[PDB]
Amino acid sequence: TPVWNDNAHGVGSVPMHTDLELDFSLTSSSKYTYRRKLTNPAQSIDLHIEIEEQTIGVDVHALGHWFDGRLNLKTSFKYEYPWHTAKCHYERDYQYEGCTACGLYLDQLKPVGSAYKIITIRYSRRVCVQFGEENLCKIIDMNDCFVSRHVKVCIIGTVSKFSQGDTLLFFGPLEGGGLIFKHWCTSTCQFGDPGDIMSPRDKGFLCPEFPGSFRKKATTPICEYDGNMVSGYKKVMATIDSFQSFNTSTMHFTDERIEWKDPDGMLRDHINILVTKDIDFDNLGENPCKIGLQTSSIEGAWGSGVGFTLTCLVSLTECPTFLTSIKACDKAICYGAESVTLTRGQNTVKVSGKGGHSGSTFRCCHGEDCSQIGLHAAAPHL
Amino acid sequence: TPVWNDNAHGVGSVPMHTDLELDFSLTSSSKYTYRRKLTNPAQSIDLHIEIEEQTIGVDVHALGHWFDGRLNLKTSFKYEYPWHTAKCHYERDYQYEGCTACGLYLDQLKPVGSAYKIITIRYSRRVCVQFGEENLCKIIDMNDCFVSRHVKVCIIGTVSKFSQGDTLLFFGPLEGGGLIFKHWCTSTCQFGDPGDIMSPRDKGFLCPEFPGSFRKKATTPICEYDGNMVSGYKKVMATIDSFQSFNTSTMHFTDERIEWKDPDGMLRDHINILVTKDIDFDNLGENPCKIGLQTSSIEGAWGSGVGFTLTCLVSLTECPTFLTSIKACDKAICYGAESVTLTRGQNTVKVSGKGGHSGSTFRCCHGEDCSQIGLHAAAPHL
């Protein structure tokens, strides 16, 4: 007969047994403080609420640096091309009757920015509530709720600035801001594209294609190339106003993740705060079920839009069944979650996730509780 | 003087005459159940609420299968090319002083997945409410409300995973999941692009372009082609981690539509449930207006991002005017809606819609009531 469920984050209330409601639209980039002494219609309760500015957390794959460069054309006339040491090149031989060779190569290379592929975007605010001698702080994700015996704080919002798959480019001492690219080259990079010339890891260029053709023109042959000769950096700069900038504040780069506070004050979210002074709220997720967790296996990749899957062994006691969520987390960041009705005893639960880095150990978690160890996922782009 | 309007789905309440509020953030992929006996401060009322998991419904155009293949180059030397039977080919003749022909053709073709263009995305939850001997179930769209005399259930949420225009690729026995492509080729498909080699309907390939050039190189000429030789499937697989996967559960494919439950447990929506035990809510859309409906004509297409327009003849009685919505629906799925202030008597109302398939008969509907017949739209991509 029981059907315990902790996936509901919120409260049941009797509107006549509630004492205070705060309901408002708040600038995303602003904090908010509320302080009041709650008195009886000779004992007072101190209420102190602090809501911090909206933070964005983006799980990314670092793509390395984008480069500007010049495309050079050379003519030579077995026996190797004069330009052979160039990493990025294209050639055609005209031979017989040794050869007579046309070559293209990139040179005057210079890094212009660092690029990051968006894997996941999540917004949150840190919320702290003191009610009497109770003090509790929690990072509340947008579209989730802070729940306590006497106070509920729900945040509801939407933002459409960034999308999964976008590429963020930072031109310099990041902070300040960057550009969003919606069409950074991936499966085909041709010279001229945004993202054309990349160095994924300081060494090794991923060279673009040169889709055009050579031609040979009473003396010496002269080579011509009839494709595009303008680098992607130059083409983008020539129409820079076509691209979308964003600004940042208090940036924090870590491996495969960027967090910051977006200072765009045009954005708002909705905050609702409900307080009951006497009779406790009915916590909708209250239950007597107890969960033990450990990892079993993992497959897939960090830093990947495809992602990974963490297999968890989950033990349920004190309930016949329990509808809940099992998460894949490491160091207080969660990368995926699976809603599941557990049955009493052992359960096997697969959790699909995305994000993290080579050093991540993805743990099986329930609420704030996690397994003793996590598992590493595989590298992407092998 | 009257200005009846049923476009407001919700209630007016006196907060002191309300008995229970449930307010919470719920895991999108989780159900929720609430059961309580409502008692007087010796007669009890059974309250039973069942909210089902979020479902996504996507109106799509089935694009057929994407293929891998190999690009082959041949040299021949009136009188037809040795490779002439290949559906996808490209040739250049070098003649005079019969010809001497260079050819490219695709072969070793193999279907790798089924592709679907997103036309419309809608999320919903089925909500069932028992209050006493009243029992009512309704599919509630995200950002709409369930309304009854004693209970309101509103769902508010946002999801940004899928966008109109995205292409979904399913690699195998769909269920499990798929990939999202944001740049599947449409107006120009070149060999190497995602979507390059398609078969829209099991027969007939839509062949990609081959943008490169041929060249002819003491004996026989040998042809060369200087464009890309790697298929789009291979190029995408080589950088697969650049693309975004999604997972699915309890899939249901129908013609030009896919429905499933997304098991991503990181997503949440907001649920508000308000209950009045005694005095009925004021239903904000209550009215005495009566509507009769029939179709008049249709133009445009199913399976199209451009869409169709259904013209409806709508009769209004019992009101001088009525602000309401007229919808284009078939088999309990609605594909478009027009808000309109009807005037007493006959009205002509045009409803713009998107989606459906060749067998769809788009009917004129108001609320749960529809015309006796619907009209077929035209096919896309003719």
Added chain:
Amino acid sequence: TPVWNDNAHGVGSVPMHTDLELDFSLTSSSKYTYRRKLTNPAQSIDLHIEIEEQTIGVDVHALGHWFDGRLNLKTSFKYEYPWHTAKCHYERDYQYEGCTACGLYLDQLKPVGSAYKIITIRYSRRVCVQFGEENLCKIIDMNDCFVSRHVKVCIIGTVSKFSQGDTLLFFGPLEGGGLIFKHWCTSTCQFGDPGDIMSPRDKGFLCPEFPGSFRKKATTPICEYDGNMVSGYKKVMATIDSFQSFNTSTMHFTDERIEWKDPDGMLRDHINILVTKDIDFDNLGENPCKIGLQTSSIEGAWGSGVGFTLTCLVSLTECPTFLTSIKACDKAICYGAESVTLTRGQNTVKVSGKGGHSGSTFRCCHGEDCSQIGLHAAAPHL
């Protein structure tokens, strides 16, 4: 000790001291009216609320007209090409032993539509509230709240139809509707792309690239070109159902901005209206701080996805500190905002914005109050 903050738009209420709540999901394209006489459990208060249809305001850059055309190939044999007057052309000379010239040129040019790049998208509803002899109307942005002593109206919603960076194409007497393009050419335009042939300002074509190659074939040489010969307009029309249409009503074009009401009746937003008859709401943004404003400088561009930055000199009196927002606005439209904790006396505040046109004078604003003059930003695409 004080920490005044006006970034919270909303109210604190005691639920037992509130008299009426309206909560509902409203068709985006519908208005809503509520009229009631508020009576004591012999004096009545007239309540009259009018909510107007959702309006979209899009800051854009007008891209000029897109053209259809025909690609013509000519052979000629110092001394200028027969086709030299064509604005869009491509040539290769085959010379020595004067030249023998192959040329391509565009002709039969015809404008097919007007294109606009989306810079910013904002939705709003006009809300008017009469409570007794108080009457107040305000344009309320989605996810903001109307706040007065006796009535709060909050709008919460999300729409995903348009994105920053999309290109809107209007084919004719705009109104009716248009097409959305997610991949309009920017940094590289090749013949065949959406956006290939543009005229930014009635004179001057921005010509596309012709990435293919010429070749020369007992008499006269004949030129061939092996690249794409089909215009972008024709290629798009050939697969028009792949693109997304939208409809419009009561359009209003101004320089670099378009406003309209989207008649898509499938879209809804959420409206909450709370009324207290007797004791005034606690306005969460109430404060005694007083602000003076003037511009100091500006940099950056109108009509640009990169944007501008307006530097404001802001004087704070009557408070030691004040957390608020300073905006960049002109003629009752705001283009950016910065949340800031001002300190008593002078402050320098930088406000990042996007949008506007050459005639815009961006002013420093707080609430409904603005500086006496604004500053012009620079043109984009110079």
